[PDB]
Amino acid sequence: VTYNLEKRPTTIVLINDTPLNVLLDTGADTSVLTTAHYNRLKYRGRKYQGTGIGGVGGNVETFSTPVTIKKKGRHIKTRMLVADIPVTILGRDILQDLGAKLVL
Amino acid sequence: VTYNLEKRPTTIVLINDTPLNVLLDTGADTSVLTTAHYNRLKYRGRKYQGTGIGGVGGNVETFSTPVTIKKKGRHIKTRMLVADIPVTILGRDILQDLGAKLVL
Numbered sequence: 001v002t003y004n005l006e007k008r009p010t011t012i013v014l015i016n017d018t019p020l021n022v023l024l025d026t027g028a029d030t031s032v033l034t035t036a037h038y039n040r041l042k043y044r045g046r047k048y049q050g051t052g053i054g055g056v057g058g059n060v061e062t063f064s065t066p067v068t069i070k071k072k073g074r075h076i077k078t079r080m081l082v083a084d085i086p087v088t089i090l091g092r093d094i095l096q097d098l099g100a101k102l103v104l
Numbered sequence: 105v106t107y108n109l110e111k112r113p114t115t116i117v118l119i120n121d122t123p124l125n126v127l128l129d130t131g132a133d134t135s136v137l138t139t140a141h142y143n144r145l146k147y148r149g150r151k152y153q154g155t156g157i158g159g160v161g162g163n164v165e166t167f168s169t170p171v172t173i174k175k176k177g178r179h180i181k182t183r184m185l186v187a188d189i190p191v192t193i194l195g196r197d198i199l200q201d202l203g204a205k206l207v208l
């Protein structure tokens with residue numbers, strides 16, 4: 001599917017068997033699940049301490065956690081960061097894995 | 105051109121006749137020039153007070169300024185926000201104008 005950017009590009013993905021609406025963000029180097037979302041997952045793996053991320057408002061502490069993402073018939077097994085951010089974002093690391101491309 | 109997201113999707117655009125490397129960010133609702141970049145523009149228009157933007161680290165104050173952007177043979181005349189952020193970002197407002205699309 002093609003997102004023309006009239007609205008924020010969001011889609012539902014299954015993370016640890018829980019359908020979540022996520023933002024597809026080419027400006028995010030890495031993917032981050034909101035703490036609220038991490039707490040609603042049907043299954044959770046261990047929490048590994050992380051070393052933060054930065055954005056427009058400064059830096060925020062993170063932890064990392066193992067997840068399985070299902071979308072586009074792919075089963076991706078990776079680590080995602082967790083942080084108190086406003087929305088769950090799929091960044092370049094997972095976007096590359098799913099085959100997403102930005103065309104200008 | 106197609107960005108496969110192995111690296112941050114950046115490109116050079118001319119803003120007020122000044123070539124700048126900008127980040128193409130589908131996660132940004134609106135475009136923001138860094139203060140450093142605004143100060144290096146060959147030409148600058150008036151500054152209009154704005155009402156901030158938010159991101160991962162909280163909110164940051166902004167002002168808006170009229171600009172002309174040239175890229176892909178288009179001449180776009182619009183307003184961009186200015187703020188002390190780490191990089192200049194072209195968000196959905198300008199991305200839509202240039203015809204960019206994200207494909208998943």
Ligand SMILES: CC[C@H](NC(=O)C[C@H](O)[C@H](CC(C)C)NC(=O)[C@@H](NC(=O)[C@H](Cc1cccc2ccccc12)NC(C)=O)C(C)C)C(=O)N[C@@H](Cc1cccc2ccccc12)C(N)=O
Pocket residue numbers: 008023025026027028029030032052053054055056086087089129130131132133134135136156157158159160189190191193195
């Ligand atoms: C972890 C992600 C980080 N990237 C980023 O923060 C860049 C990424 O596009 C982010 C997603 C947004 C969703 C947090 N975008 C923004 O912050 C943009 N905000 C908006 O559009 C808001 C959206 C927004 C705000 C509030 C609530 C929202 C609820 C739902 C949806 C959107 C929401 N609208 C407004 C009107 O306030 C700004 C750029 C215009 C990142 O890649 N960090 C890097 C490198 C880095 C370090 C320091 C500062 C950076 C600043 C920008 C990009 C990268 C930066 C890293 N390695 O840590």
